[PDB]
Design a protein around this nucleic acid. Structure first.
Length: 80
DNA sequence: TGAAAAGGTAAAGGAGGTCTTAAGCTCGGCTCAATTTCTCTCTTTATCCTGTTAGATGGTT
C-alpha cells in the first residue's frame, strides 16, 4: 500500500506539468490535475519494471489519456 | 195560453291536412388501380471501454 502511495505521490509534479498544457479547454486547472491523478494511479498500477523503461515515459500516456477523456466527458453542459 | 229564449239538427262551404305523380338530382356501392403502414430481416452505425513505453516532474494573469 505504502509503495503504491509513494509512487503516485512523488509523481504528482509530473501530473501538474502535463495538466498545465490544457488550462483553456473547458476544465479548470484544478480539475485537470485531479483527473490526471487518476491516470497516474492507473499508470502506477500497470507499470512494468522488467520493461526497462523510466516511469516518466509510461505514466505520461495514462495522464494524458485521463485528462483528454475528462475534457471529452466534463467540459460541456450538453456533453458530446 | 202565448210568448220569449235557449238549444238543437241538417247543410254548404270553406280551411286544412294528407295523399298522389313527372323532373331532377346525388349518393352509395361496386370494382379496381393505386398506392401508405407494418413487420420481419439485415445492416449499420452510435456509444462505451481499454490500452499507449525515449524523457519529461510547482501557474498566469
Amino acid at each position: 500500500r505504502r509503495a503504491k502511495d509513494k509512487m503516485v505521490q512523488s509523481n504528482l509534479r509530473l501530473v501538474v506539468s502535463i495538466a498545465k498544457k490544457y488550462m483553456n479547454r473547458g476544465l479548470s486547472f484544478q480539475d485537470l490535475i485531479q483527473e490526471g491523478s487518476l491516470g497516474l494511479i492507473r499508470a502506477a498500477e500497470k507499470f512494468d519494471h522488467e520493461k526497462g523503461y523510466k516511469f516518466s515515459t509510461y505514466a505520461t500516456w495514462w495522464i494524458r489519456q485521463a485528462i483528454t477523456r475528462a475534457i471529452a466527458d466534463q467540459s460541456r453542459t450538453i456533453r458530446l
